Design a protein around this ligand. Structure first.
Ligand SMILES: [Zn+2]
Ligand SMILES: [Zn+2]
Ligand SMILES: [Zn+2]
Ligand SMILES: [Zn+2]
Ligand SMILES: [Zn+2]
Ligand SMILES: [Zn+2]
Ligand SMILES: [Zn+2]
Ligand SMILES: [Zn+2]
Length: 203
């Protein structure tokens, strides 16, 4: 089955593993994982993080035919489990100095969920994209500005985390996937660029 192919030691995740808009797995509510994790579930998380590392690496992205990304959910690999990986890099300064921290967020999250959020909404100015969606989709994807999430790591340790800005948006977008929600579900149906007063537009 799909998970068996993905977790083979020599197997690298690429675009051929990513299912496409229309595939029913994208619309399911993914199943919670139980702890302790199976070896498959642990390796799957590791492969998913590796895929994001590769997508952000100039050489490996070219070798594998990948395009940059910051998040991946297991349903996108045809695996209906509540597993996501997020990897959001910090950026060099104007002088070309690497940041203090390589990443502002780097986690493989098991059973993640939003436990509370701000009343205020936010949206990326440039909209959102998706590896499973081979269409141009304009518009503000309206999300919570700030969230508090809970999730478990591969060890079963529970974490509780507050997020805002871009990382809030990235997380979620990935949580949506494990609930069978697609980004364009959160775009205004009649005017993609409608702005309800108070919306935080993120640059
Ligand atoms: Zn493959
Ligand atoms: Zn391991
Ligand atoms: Zn590598
Ligand atoms: Zn709680
Ligand atoms: Zn609420
Ligand atoms: Zn996505
Ligand atoms: Zn919500
Ligand atoms: Zn629509």
């Amino acid at each position: 089955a799909a998970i068996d192919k993905l977790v083979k030691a020599s197997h690298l995740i690429d675009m051929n593993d990513i299912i496409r808009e229309g595939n029913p797995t994208l619309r399911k509510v993914a199943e919670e994982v139980t702890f302790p994790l199976s070896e498959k579930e642990e390796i799957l998380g590791e492969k998913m993080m590796q895929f994001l590392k590769h997508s952000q690496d100039p050489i490996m992205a070219e070798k594998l035919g990948l395009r940059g990304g910051v998040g991946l959910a297991a349903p996108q690999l045809d695996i209906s489990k509540r597993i996501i990986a997020v990897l959001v890099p910090n950026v060099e300064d104007a002088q070309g100095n690497p940041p203090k921290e390589a990443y502002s967020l780097q986690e493989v999250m098991y059973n993640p969920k939003v436990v509370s959020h701000s009343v205020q909404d936010a949206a990326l100015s440039d909209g959102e994209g998706c590896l499973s969606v081979d269409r141009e989709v304009p518009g503000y994807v309206v999300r919570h500005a700030r969230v508090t999430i809970e999730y478990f790591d591969k060890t079963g340790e529970k974490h509780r985390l507050k997020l805002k800005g871009y990382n809030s948006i990235v997380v979620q977008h990935e949580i949506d996937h494990i609930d069978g929600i697609m980004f364009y579900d959160r775009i205004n149906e009649k005017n993609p660029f409608a702005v309800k007063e108070g919306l935080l537009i993120l640059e």
